Amino acid sequence: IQRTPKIQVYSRHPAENGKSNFLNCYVSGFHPSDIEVDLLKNGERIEKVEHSDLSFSKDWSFYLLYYTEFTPTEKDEYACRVNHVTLSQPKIVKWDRDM
Amino acid sequence: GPAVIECWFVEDASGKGLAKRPGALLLRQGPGEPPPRPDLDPELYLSVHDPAGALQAAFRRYPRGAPAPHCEMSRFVPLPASAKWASGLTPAQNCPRALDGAWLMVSISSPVLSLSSLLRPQPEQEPVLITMATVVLTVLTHTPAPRVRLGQDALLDLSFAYMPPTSEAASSLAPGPPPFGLEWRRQHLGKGHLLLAATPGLNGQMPAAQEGAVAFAAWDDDEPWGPWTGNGTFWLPRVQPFQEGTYLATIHLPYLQGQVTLELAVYKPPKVSLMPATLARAAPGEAPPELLCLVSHFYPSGGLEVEWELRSQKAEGQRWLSALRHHSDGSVSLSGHLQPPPVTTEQHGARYACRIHHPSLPASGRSAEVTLEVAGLSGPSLEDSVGLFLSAFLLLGLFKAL
Amino acid sequence: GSHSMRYFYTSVSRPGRGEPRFISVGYVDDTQFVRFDSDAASPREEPRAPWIEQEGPEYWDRNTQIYKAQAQTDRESLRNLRGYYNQSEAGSHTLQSMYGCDVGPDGRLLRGHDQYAYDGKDYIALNEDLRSWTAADTAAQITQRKWEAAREAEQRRAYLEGECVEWLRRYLENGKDKLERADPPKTHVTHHPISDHEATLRCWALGFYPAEITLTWQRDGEDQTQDTELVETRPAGDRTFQKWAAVVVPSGEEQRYTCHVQHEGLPKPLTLRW
Ligand SMILES: *[C@@H]1O[C@H](CO)[C@@H](O[C@@H]2O[C@H](CO)[C@@H](O)[C@H](O)[C@H]2NC(C)=O)[C@H](O)[C@H]1NC(C)=O
Ligand SMILES: *[C@@H]1O[C@H](CO)[C@@H](O)[C@H](O)[C@H]1NC(C)=O
């Protein structure tokens, strides 16, 4: 069976404009393990993005965390775009500052 | 009534890794020579004799035109049940003598039924073209893939039939059906539970049933002589999404096991609503409100497709969603967001529509609509006229004042 | 509280791109402490936790050889299962094995796991009684019957109740400074007016360890489970976790509701009001 990734986009700390922070995209619960994840700022991919090692859950699925330094700004918008074999086109989920 | 079932004999030797060979099951030989099958190995060409008649009856009423059932044969060596609850079926260490010989386990799966049988081939030159095999234990289900709405009951079907094998002049037992064990387990996402264990006909302590589940585990009659039919139906009172997955049912006799598997799928149709329902604001250019489409309390989480339309046409505007929100009942809720482009007079009376396609939903889906209001040559209301009069009066008074 | 040690083995077939990739990872409380990767430049068993680095090189050479053997075995099993299931050799399929022990706060074994999966589906598992096996299809049932004849469940029971628990205790002692810590959550409520007559109250729990936590919304002491949205617990990225729970309430009635937070690091459950 194949399972579609579940995506969350958040920040390591509560967002304050002008204060450095980390933006995280957490992808989990997908099978198989091949997946593409990008972090977008105003629709453009971010170059400096690190991620953790592929992880394994007891439910026979995988999860990953991508993160990048950023300074929250009222004008700028951020999103996570994920492409997996189980979805037709890449799914983007936006970073709601309070969700 | 296929009258023949093609089967794949699966080698059990370690050296040969799940090798497969052709074979056939001849349910109805009929008077005369059985159809010649020189392509098959003689030992894998079986003529089935079913004193109980469960295997015969299962395929006697098989739907016409349905795809051929998927059959697999394998070699079987009787072993005592390893589960601790089924310890009273084999009180003594000595293996029964009546279970000597060769045994074949046959599994036949189809969209309409799932069946498992224990057969005994006969070693029996001239009749080598066919191999006679008698059925001993049959376990079948007519609900191999049940679908149950969230909060409803599930009635996983299970029947079985047992004809004791030739005793070899060692049938000094109690007349009547022998005690048996019934096992119902679940497996899903690396998690397994013993939902139910029973031993009808034998008094002993069974592990407590889980999730308030009960079974109709009994022999259909207590006649002194077999074959005997029996029931093992499973009743799961309320089905939550965490009880989805593979349900395995096993019938245990001393040194004999018969297993079938079912796939229970839980579903809940979404409730769709486009949050902006007060039509919309003026559309003299730009300033379009953001439309939110809430689909609430649907299972499974995956497979939902939300699409935006203009009223039919492909809606224009930025689109995204929000991470799943999980409720106590196990269902999930999703929110789609559409930001249309600058609305103008050309979109007067045009409705923005959110349409949801989900496996639980019908092929059409479920739709919500919001009419797009535009600014027009609306006439002043009575209150507007009164306000104009009052403003003019105040302004003229002020002009007189200064 | 409850602790666990788990070992995951994963072989992913790559038709036309080389032999299957093999990854082996060891976890304590969802924190990895050892890892192997055939794609890695150096095929070695590399520790990845500060509380296992003090061990000697032999513990690593032996593991590396064991995991190379495991990789070969998993590749052979991948080929056998692809043959059995009648699948094209150009597709990608995965074979997963997991084994470990979950021990309670008393240091005594609670559960022991030995499971396999093919293409993300259960293939054969050891049951909670540590005596029998669950196998669905005929290929898995053949292995089930071979293992029952050979009585492998006895050896696995001896290992899980023995070496696994001992090593889990040893790890929980050598690295108690981070494995046995309990960071309480930092909580606050947020108000968002959805429509003219409805608001959303969102309760937050940030920077807590372990991940186990309970968030509830109550209206004059009555749970609002049906009308409560939840985001799954997520990693902040610095060894702590985040979660929030949202409840929709009528406008003006935002004082009767209360958010109840339960976590180990909290001496008493927290009650939060907007
Ligand atoms: C096994 O037992 C179940 C439950 O007793 C049988 O189903 C019942 O059948 C009767 C007679 O047809 C109906 O009135 C009941 O409504 C059924 N109950 C349920 C829960 O569906 C079932 O037919 C039995 N199986 C066999 C083959 O005898
Ligand atoms: C594999 O599937 C093909 C296509 O349906 C079929 O012709 C063939 O007989 C199958 N092989 C086995 C061993 O089941």
mmCIF file of N, CA, C and O in Angstrom, chain B residues 15-86:
data_model
loop_
_atom_site.group_PDB
_atom_site.id
_atom_site.type_symbol
_atom_site.label_atom_id
_atom_site.label_comp_id
_atom_site.label_asym_id
_atom_site.label_seq_id
_atom_site.Cartn_x
_atom_site.Cartn_y
_atom_site.Cartn_z
ATOM 1 N N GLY B 15 15.622 -23.895 0.193
ATOM 2 C CA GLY B 15 16.434 -23.655 -0.991
ATOM 3 C C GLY B 15 15.665 -22.942 -2.086
ATOM 4 O O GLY B 15 16.154 -21.979 -2.681
ATOM 5 N N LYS B 16 14.449 -23.406 -2.365
ATOM 6 C CA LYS B 16 13.587 -22.784 -3.365
ATOM 7 C C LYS B 16 12.764 -21.702 -2.680
ATOM 8 O O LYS B 16 11.919 -21.999 -1.829
ATOM 9 N N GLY B 17 13.003 -20.447 -3.051
ATOM 10 C CA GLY B 17 12.338 -19.343 -2.391
ATOM 11 C C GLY B 17 10.993 -19.018 -3.001
ATOM 12 O O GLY B 17 10.911 -18.312 -4.010
ATOM 13 N N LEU B 18 9.928 -19.532 -2.386
ATOM 14 C CA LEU B 18 8.561 -19.276 -2.833
ATOM 15 C C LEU B 18 8.413 -19.547 -4.327
ATOM 16 O O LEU B 18 7.780 -18.786 -5.060
ATOM 17 N N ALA B 19 9.014 -20.641 -4.785
ATOM 18 C CA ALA B 19 8.796 -21.087 -6.150
ATOM 19 C C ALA B 19 7.341 -21.499 -6.329
ATOM 20 O O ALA B 19 6.659 -21.875 -5.374
ATOM 21 N N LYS B 20 6.857 -21.411 -7.564
ATOM 22 C CA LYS B 20 5.458 -21.683 -7.863
ATOM 23 C C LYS B 20 5.349 -22.633 -9.045
ATOM 24 O O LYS B 20 6.089 -22.511 -10.024
ATOM 25 N N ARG B 21 4.421 -23.582 -8.941
ATOM 26 C CA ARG B 21 4.151 -24.556 -9.985
ATOM 27 C C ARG B 21 2.659 -24.600 -10.282
ATOM 28 O O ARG B 21 1.840 -24.370 -9.389
ATOM 29 N N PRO B 22 2.275 -24.883 -11.526
ATOM 30 C CA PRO B 22 0.847 -24.974 -11.845
ATOM 31 C C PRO B 22 0.191 -26.189 -11.212
ATOM 32 O O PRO B 22 0.809 -27.241 -11.035
ATOM 33 N N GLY B 23 -1.089 -26.034 -10.885
ATOM 34 C CA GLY B 23 -1.900 -27.150 -10.442
ATOM 35 C C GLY B 23 -3.354 -26.828 -10.685
ATOM 36 O O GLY B 23 -3.712 -25.698 -11.020
ATOM 37 N N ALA B 24 -4.201 -27.835 -10.508
ATOM 38 C CA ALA B 24 -5.628 -27.653 -10.711
ATOM 39 C C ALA B 24 -6.404 -28.396 -9.637
ATOM 40 O O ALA B 24 -5.967 -29.433 -9.136
ATOM 41 N N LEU B 25 -7.562 -27.843 -9.290
ATOM 42 C CA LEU B 25 -8.529 -28.484 -8.410
ATOM 43 C C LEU B 25 -9.762 -28.817 -9.236
ATOM 44 O O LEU B 25 -10.350 -27.928 -9.862
ATOM 45 N N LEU B 26 -10.152 -30.085 -9.228
ATOM 46 C CA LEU B 26 -11.269 -30.595 -10.019
ATOM 47 C C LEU B 26 -12.415 -30.857 -9.047
ATOM 48 O O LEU B 26 -12.551 -31.951 -8.500
ATOM 49 N N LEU B 27 -13.247 -29.836 -8.843
ATOM 50 C CA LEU B 27 -14.325 -29.941 -7.866
ATOM 51 C C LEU B 27 -15.321 -31.025 -8.255
ATOM 52 O O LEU B 27 -15.827 -31.752 -7.394
ATOM 53 N N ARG B 28 -15.622 -31.143 -9.547
ATOM 54 C CA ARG B 28 -16.644 -32.064 -10.044
ATOM 55 C C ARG B 28 -16.026 -32.931 -11.136
ATOM 56 O O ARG B 28 -15.908 -32.499 -12.287
ATOM 57 N N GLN B 29 -15.637 -34.156 -10.774
ATOM 58 C CA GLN B 29 -15.018 -35.051 -11.746
ATOM 59 C C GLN B 29 -16.051 -35.611 -12.716
ATOM 60 O O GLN B 29 -15.786 -35.720 -13.919
ATOM 61 N N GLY B 30 -17.231 -35.969 -12.215
ATOM 62 C CA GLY B 30 -18.273 -36.522 -13.044
ATOM 63 C C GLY B 30 -17.952 -37.936 -13.488
ATOM 64 O O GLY B 30 -16.787 -38.343 -13.529
ATOM 65 N N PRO B 31 -18.978 -38.718 -13.826
ATOM 66 C CA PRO B 31 -18.730 -40.091 -14.296
ATOM 67 C C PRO B 31 -17.821 -40.101 -15.515
ATOM 68 O O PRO B 31 -18.109 -39.467 -16.533
ATOM 69 N N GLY B 32 -16.718 -40.829 -15.407
ATOM 70 C CA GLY B 32 -15.781 -40.999 -16.497
ATOM 71 C C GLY B 32 -14.405 -40.461 -16.153
ATOM 72 O O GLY B 32 -14.140 -39.999 -15.045
ATOM 73 N N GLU B 33 -13.525 -40.533 -17.146
ATOM 74 C CA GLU B 33 -12.158 -40.072 -16.968
ATOM 75 C C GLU B 33 -12.134 -38.560 -16.750
ATOM 76 O O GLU B 33 -12.811 -37.817 -17.467
ATOM 77 N N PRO B 34 -11.364 -38.069 -15.772
ATOM 78 C CA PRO B 34 -11.237 -36.623 -15.609
ATOM 79 C C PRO B 34 -10.492 -36.015 -16.782
ATOM 80 O O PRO B 34 -9.684 -36.695 -17.439
ATOM 81 N N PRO B 35 -10.722 -34.741 -17.082
ATOM 82 C CA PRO B 35 -10.047 -34.115 -18.224
ATOM 83 C C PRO B 35 -8.543 -34.296 -18.129
ATOM 84 O O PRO B 35 -7.947 -34.038 -17.073
ATOM 85 N N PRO B 36 -7.889 -34.739 -19.202
ATOM 86 C CA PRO B 36 -6.437 -34.935 -19.134
ATOM 87 C C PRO B 36 -5.699 -33.607 -19.085
ATOM 88 O O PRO B 36 -6.006 -32.674 -19.831
ATOM 89 N N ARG B 37 -4.716 -33.531 -18.191
ATOM 90 C CA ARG B 37 -3.877 -32.345 -18.019
ATOM 91 C C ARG B 37 -2.418 -32.779 -18.029
ATOM 92 O O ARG B 37 -1.751 -32.789 -16.988
ATOM 93 N N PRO B 38 -1.891 -33.153 -19.197
ATOM 94 C CA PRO B 38 -0.473 -33.544 -19.264
ATOM 95 C C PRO B 38 0.477 -32.414 -18.917
ATOM 96 O O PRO B 38 1.639 -32.681 -18.583
ATOM 97 N N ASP B 39 0.024 -31.162 -18.989
ATOM 98 C CA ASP B 39 0.871 -30.030 -18.631
ATOM 99 C C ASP B 39 1.143 -29.955 -17.134
ATOM 100 O O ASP B 39 2.156 -29.376 -16.732
ATOM 101 N N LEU B 40 0.271 -30.522 -16.307
ATOM 102 C CA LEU B 40 0.406 -30.431 -14.862
ATOM 103 C C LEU B 40 1.192 -31.614 -14.313
ATOM 104 O O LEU B 40 1.153 -32.719 -14.858
ATOM 105 N N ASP B 41 1.908 -31.364 -13.223
ATOM 106 C CA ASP B 41 2.515 -32.453 -12.475
ATOM 107 C C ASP B 41 1.413 -33.330 -11.883
ATOM 108 O O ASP B 41 0.431 -32.809 -11.346
ATOM 109 N N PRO B 42 1.535 -34.659 -11.968
ATOM 110 C CA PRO B 42 0.438 -35.509 -11.474
ATOM 111 C C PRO B 42 0.059 -35.251 -10.025
ATOM 112 O O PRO B 42 -1.124 -35.341 -9.681
ATOM 113 N N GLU B 43 1.027 -34.936 -9.161
ATOM 114 C CA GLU B 43 0.713 -34.729 -7.752
ATOM 115 C C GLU B 43 -0.018 -33.417 -7.502
ATOM 116 O O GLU B 43 -0.686 -33.284 -6.472
ATOM 117 N N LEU B 44 0.098 -32.447 -8.406
ATOM 118 C CA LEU B 44 -0.564 -31.159 -8.250
ATOM 119 C C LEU B 44 -1.914 -31.100 -8.948
ATOM 120 O O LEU B 44 -2.572 -30.057 -8.899
ATOM 121 N N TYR B 45 -2.342 -32.181 -9.596
ATOM 122 C CA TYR B 45 -3.666 -32.264 -10.201
ATOM 123 C C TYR B 45 -4.555 -33.062 -9.255
ATOM 124 O O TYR B 45 -4.403 -34.282 -9.128
ATOM 125 N N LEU B 46 -5.488 -32.375 -8.604
ATOM 126 C CA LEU B 46 -6.272 -32.940 -7.518
ATOM 127 C C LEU B 46 -7.740 -33.024 -7.906
ATOM 128 O O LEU B 46 -8.285 -32.103 -8.516
ATOM 129 N N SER B 47 -8.361 -34.143 -7.556
ATOM 130 C CA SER B 47 -9.808 -34.298 -7.591
ATOM 131 C C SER B 47 -10.310 -34.255 -6.156
ATOM 132 O O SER B 47 -9.904 -35.078 -5.327
ATOM 133 N N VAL B 48 -11.194 -33.304 -5.868
ATOM 134 C CA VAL B 48 -11.584 -32.976 -4.501
ATOM 135 C C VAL B 48 -12.866 -33.716 -4.152
ATOM 136 O O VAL B 48 -13.866 -33.621 -4.872
ATOM 137 N N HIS B 49 -12.833 -34.453 -3.046
ATOM 138 C CA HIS B 49 -14.007 -35.093 -2.468
ATOM 139 C C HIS B 49 -14.330 -34.385 -1.161
ATOM 140 O O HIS B 49 -13.504 -34.365 -0.243
ATOM 141 N N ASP B 50 -15.529 -33.815 -1.072
ATOM 142 C CA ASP B 50 -15.918 -32.970 0.054
ATOM 143 C C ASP B 50 -17.119 -33.588 0.757
ATOM 144 O O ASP B 50 -18.272 -33.298 0.403
ATOM 145 N N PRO B 51 -16.900 -34.445 1.757
ATOM 146 C CA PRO B 51 -18.043 -34.969 2.522
ATOM 147 C C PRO B 51 -18.854 -33.882 3.200
ATOM 148 O O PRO B 51 -20.078 -34.013 3.318
ATOM 149 N N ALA B 52 -18.203 -32.811 3.657
ATOM 150 C CA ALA B 52 -18.932 -31.715 4.285
ATOM 151 C C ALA B 52 -19.675 -30.882 3.250
ATOM 152 O O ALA B 52 -20.785 -30.405 3.511
ATOM 153 N N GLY B 53 -19.081 -30.697 2.075
ATOM 154 C CA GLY B 53 -19.728 -29.979 0.997
ATOM 155 C C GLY B 53 -19.633 -28.473 1.066
ATOM 156 O O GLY B 53 -20.291 -27.795 0.269
ATOM 157 N N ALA B 54 -18.848 -27.918 1.993
ATOM 158 C CA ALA B 54 -18.715 -26.467 2.073
ATOM 159 C C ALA B 54 -17.927 -25.921 0.889
ATOM 160 O O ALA B 54 -18.332 -24.937 0.259
ATOM 161 N N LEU B 55 -16.792 -26.549 0.571
ATOM 162 C CA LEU B 55 -15.991 -26.104 -0.564
ATOM 163 C C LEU B 55 -16.766 -26.236 -1.868
ATOM 164 O O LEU B 55 -16.714 -25.344 -2.723
ATOM 165 N N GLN B 56 -17.489 -27.343 -2.040
ATOM 166 C CA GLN B 56 -18.287 -27.528 -3.247
ATOM 167 C C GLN B 56 -19.366 -26.457 -3.354
ATOM 168 O O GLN B 56 -19.543 -25.838 -4.409
ATOM 169 N N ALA B 57 -20.093 -26.222 -2.260
ATOM 170 C CA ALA B 57 -21.200 -25.274 -2.284
ATOM 171 C C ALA B 57 -20.716 -23.844 -2.474
ATOM 172 O O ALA B 57 -21.444 -23.015 -3.031
ATOM 173 N N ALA B 58 -19.504 -23.530 -2.010
ATOM 174 C CA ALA B 58 -18.999 -22.171 -2.151
ATOM 175 C C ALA B 58 -18.895 -21.773 -3.617
ATOM 176 O O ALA B 58 -19.287 -20.664 -3.996
ATOM 177 N N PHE B 59 -18.375 -22.667 -4.457
ATOM 178 C CA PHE B 59 -18.202 -22.383 -5.873
ATOM 179 C C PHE B 59 -19.353 -22.881 -6.732
ATOM 180 O O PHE B 59 -19.387 -22.572 -7.928
ATOM 181 N N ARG B 60 -20.291 -23.641 -6.165
ATOM 182 C CA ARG B 60 -21.450 -24.058 -6.944
ATOM 183 C C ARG B 60 -22.303 -22.858 -7.334
ATOM 184 O O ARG B 60 -22.859 -22.815 -8.437
ATOM 185 N N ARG B 61 -22.413 -21.872 -6.444
ATOM 186 C CA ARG B 61 -23.203 -20.673 -6.683
ATOM 187 C C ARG B 61 -22.333 -19.478 -7.052
ATOM 188 O O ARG B 61 -22.771 -18.332 -6.912
ATOM 189 N N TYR B 62 -21.112 -19.723 -7.515
ATOM 190 C CA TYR B 62 -20.208 -18.630 -7.838
ATOM 191 C C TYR B 62 -20.799 -17.788 -8.967
ATOM 192 O O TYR B 62 -21.396 -18.337 -9.901
ATOM 193 N N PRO B 63 -20.666 -16.461 -8.917
ATOM 194 C CA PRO B 63 -21.260 -15.627 -9.968
ATOM 195 C C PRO B 63 -20.703 -15.965 -11.343
ATOM 196 O O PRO B 63 -19.518 -16.269 -11.499
ATOM 197 N N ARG B 64 -21.575 -15.906 -12.347
ATOM 198 C CA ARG B 64 -21.144 -16.108 -13.722
ATOM 199 C C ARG B 64 -20.371 -14.893 -14.219
ATOM 200 O O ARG B 64 -20.715 -13.748 -13.913
ATOM 201 N N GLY B 65 -19.315 -15.150 -14.990
ATOM 202 C CA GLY B 65 -18.538 -14.097 -15.605
ATOM 203 C C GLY B 65 -17.553 -13.408 -14.692
ATOM 204 O O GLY B 65 -16.773 -12.573 -15.169
ATOM 205 N N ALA B 66 -17.555 -13.721 -13.400
ATOM 206 C CA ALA B 66 -16.618 -13.101 -12.481
ATOM 207 C C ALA B 66 -15.205 -13.617 -12.745
ATOM 208 O O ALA B 66 -15.025 -14.717 -13.273
ATOM 209 N N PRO B 67 -14.181 -12.840 -12.390
ATOM 210 C CA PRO B 67 -12.807 -13.292 -12.628
ATOM 211 C C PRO B 67 -12.506 -14.570 -11.862
ATOM 212 O O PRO B 67 -13.044 -14.815 -10.780
ATOM 213 N N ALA B 68 -11.635 -15.389 -12.440
ATOM 214 C CA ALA B 68 -11.313 -16.667 -11.829
ATOM 215 C C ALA B 68 -10.721 -16.442 -10.440
ATOM 216 O O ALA B 68 -9.898 -15.538 -10.256
ATOM 217 N N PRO B 69 -11.111 -17.235 -9.444
ATOM 218 C CA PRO B 69 -10.562 -17.041 -8.100
ATOM 219 C C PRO B 69 -9.074 -17.343 -8.052
ATOM 220 O O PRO B 69 -8.553 -18.163 -8.811
ATOM 221 N N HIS B 70 -8.389 -16.665 -7.134
ATOM 222 C CA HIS B 70 -6.948 -16.814 -6.964
ATOM 223 C C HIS B 70 -6.687 -17.925 -5.954
ATOM 224 O O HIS B 70 -7.004 -17.780 -4.772
ATOM 225 N N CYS B 71 -6.095 -19.023 -6.414
ATOM 226 C CA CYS B 71 -5.876 -20.206 -5.594
ATOM 227 C C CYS B 71 -4.385 -20.423 -5.374
ATOM 228 O O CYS B 71 -3.571 -20.173 -6.266
ATOM 229 N N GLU B 72 -4.038 -20.889 -4.175
ATOM 230 C CA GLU B 72 -2.666 -21.250 -3.844
ATOM 231 C C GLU B 72 -2.665 -22.492 -2.967
ATOM 232 O O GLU B 72 -3.390 -22.553 -1.971
ATOM 233 N N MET B 73 -1.845 -23.472 -3.336
ATOM 234 C CA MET B 73 -1.661 -24.696 -2.570
ATOM 235 C C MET B 73 -0.306 -24.676 -1.877
ATOM 236 O O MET B 73 0.632 -24.018 -2.331
ATOM 237 N N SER B 74 -0.215 -25.396 -0.763
ATOM 238 C CA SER B 74 1.063 -25.567 -0.087
ATOM 239 C C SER B 74 1.009 -26.839 0.743
ATOM 240 O O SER B 74 -0.067 -27.357 1.042
ATOM 241 N N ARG B 75 2.186 -27.343 1.104
ATOM 242 C CA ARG B 75 2.269 -28.523 1.955
ATOM 243 C C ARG B 75 2.088 -28.129 3.413
ATOM 244 O O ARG B 75 2.546 -27.069 3.847
ATOM 245 N N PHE B 76 1.414 -28.992 4.169
ATOM 246 C CA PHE B 76 1.022 -28.708 5.541
ATOM 247 C C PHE B 76 1.457 -29.864 6.427
ATOM 248 O O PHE B 76 1.199 -31.028 6.104
ATOM 249 N N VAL B 77 2.128 -29.546 7.528
ATOM 250 C CA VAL B 77 2.510 -30.520 8.540
ATOM 251 C C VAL B 77 1.763 -30.160 9.820
ATOM 252 O O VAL B 77 1.952 -29.063 10.352
ATOM 253 N N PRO B 78 0.897 -31.026 10.348
ATOM 254 C CA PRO B 78 0.144 -30.657 11.553
ATOM 255 C C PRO B 78 1.067 -30.286 12.703
ATOM 256 O O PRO B 78 2.054 -30.968 12.982
ATOM 257 N N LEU B 79 0.726 -29.194 13.378
ATOM 258 C CA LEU B 79 1.466 -28.703 14.528
ATOM 259 C C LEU B 79 0.470 -28.308 15.606
ATOM 260 O O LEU B 79 -0.664 -27.931 15.294
ATOM 261 N N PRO B 80 0.856 -28.392 16.875
ATOM 262 C CA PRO B 80 -0.030 -27.905 17.935
ATOM 263 C C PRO B 80 -0.096 -26.387 17.941
ATOM 264 O O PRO B 80 0.871 -25.696 17.614
ATOM 265 N N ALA B 81 -1.263 -25.869 18.319
ATOM 266 C CA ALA B 81 -1.445 -24.427 18.385
ATOM 267 C C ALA B 81 -0.475 -23.822 19.390
ATOM 268 O O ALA B 81 -0.336 -24.316 20.513
ATOM 269 N N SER B 82 0.196 -22.746 18.984
ATOM 270 C CA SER B 82 1.179 -22.094 19.839
ATOM 271 C C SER B 82 0.568 -21.053 20.764
ATOM 272 O O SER B 82 1.195 -20.696 21.768
ATOM 273 N N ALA B 83 -0.630 -20.563 20.462
ATOM 274 C CA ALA B 83 -1.303 -19.637 21.360
ATOM 275 C C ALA B 83 -1.651 -20.340 22.666
ATOM 276 O O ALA B 83 -2.057 -21.505 22.674
ATOM 277 N N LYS B 84 -1.493 -19.623 23.778
ATOM 278 C CA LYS B 84 -1.652 -20.253 25.084
ATOM 279 C C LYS B 84 -3.114 -20.520 25.425
ATOM 280 O O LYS B 84 -3.408 -21.482 26.144
ATOM 281 N N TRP B 85 -4.039 -19.697 24.928
ATOM 282 C CA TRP B 85 -5.449 -19.924 25.225
ATOM 283 C C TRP B 85 -5.933 -21.249 24.652
ATOM 284 O O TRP B 85 -6.758 -21.928 25.273
ATOM 285 N N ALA B 86 -5.436 -21.636 23.481
ATOM 286 C CA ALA B 86 -5.791 -22.913 22.861
ATOM 287 C C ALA B 86 -4.887 -24.038 23.353
ATOM 288 O O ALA B 86 -4.266 -24.754 22.570
#
